[PDB]
Amino acid sequence: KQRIDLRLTDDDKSMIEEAAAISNQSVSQFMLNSASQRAAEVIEQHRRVILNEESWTRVMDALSNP
């Protein structure tokens, strides 16, 4: 539905083509799936960090006082 302009370096492109052929995908399917899974990972990590900093905040408040 949307549109994105991606520029690469003949090395990146050949390497993406090679990996896409290994995994029986189009070059677009490969780029999208790579970005999608990576974005998933990164959001999941960011969620863990947020939860960490909340429990940090909770102990540091408890050590200030009720």
Binding site: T57, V59, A62, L63
Partner: protein, 157 residues
């Protein structure tokens, strides 16, 4: 002086920070250059022993922070604890530690905390902490000691 208390750093930064001398240049300089900024950035909570003077003469301090132990299991560590020369040998250090334990016990009722780690630079501090109940540790942790929260709870019964 019969008028000293122990308070959280009240975010006033309104304390006499320069006359404090504990005997060790590292702890003095940590007080004068790091304690306030690190308390404000929530890497630690600083408790001050002082008297009810105009400017609250600083006569001792200690720090607490969240921590965890591994190989996440939550704990607190008492990072730094220092007392002015005038107050030494009189058992004021034990008193600050007891007060830090009270802070941690009170917290442990609100949040899971399994115990208190403590840091020991030299053998003087190591023997001092060892004599309050702290368990010595070994190897790469030889300069650390531990006190279970269950023991702190026993203390206040």
């Amino acid at each position: 002086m019969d008028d000293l208390t122990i308070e959280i750093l009240t975010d006033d930064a309104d304390y006499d920070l320069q006359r404090f001398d504990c005997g060790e240049e590292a702890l003095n300089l940590f007080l004068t250059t790091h304690l306030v900024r690190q308390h404000r950035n929530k890497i630690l909570r600083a408790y001050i022993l002082c008297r009810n003077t105009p400017e609250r003469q600083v006569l001792g301090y200690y720090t607490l922070c969240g921590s965890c132990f591994e190989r996440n299991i939550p704990s607190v560590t008492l990072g730094r604890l220092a007392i002015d020369r005038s107050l030494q040998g009189q058992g004021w250090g034990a008193t600050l530690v007891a007060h830090a334990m009270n802070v941690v016990w009170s917290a442990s009722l609100a949040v899971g905390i399994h115990g208190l780690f403590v840091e020991a630079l030299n053998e003087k501090a190591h023997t001092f902490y060892k004599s309050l109940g702290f368990i010595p540790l070994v190897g790469e942790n030889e300069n650390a000691l531990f006190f279970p929260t269950k023991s702190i709870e026993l203390l206040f019964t």
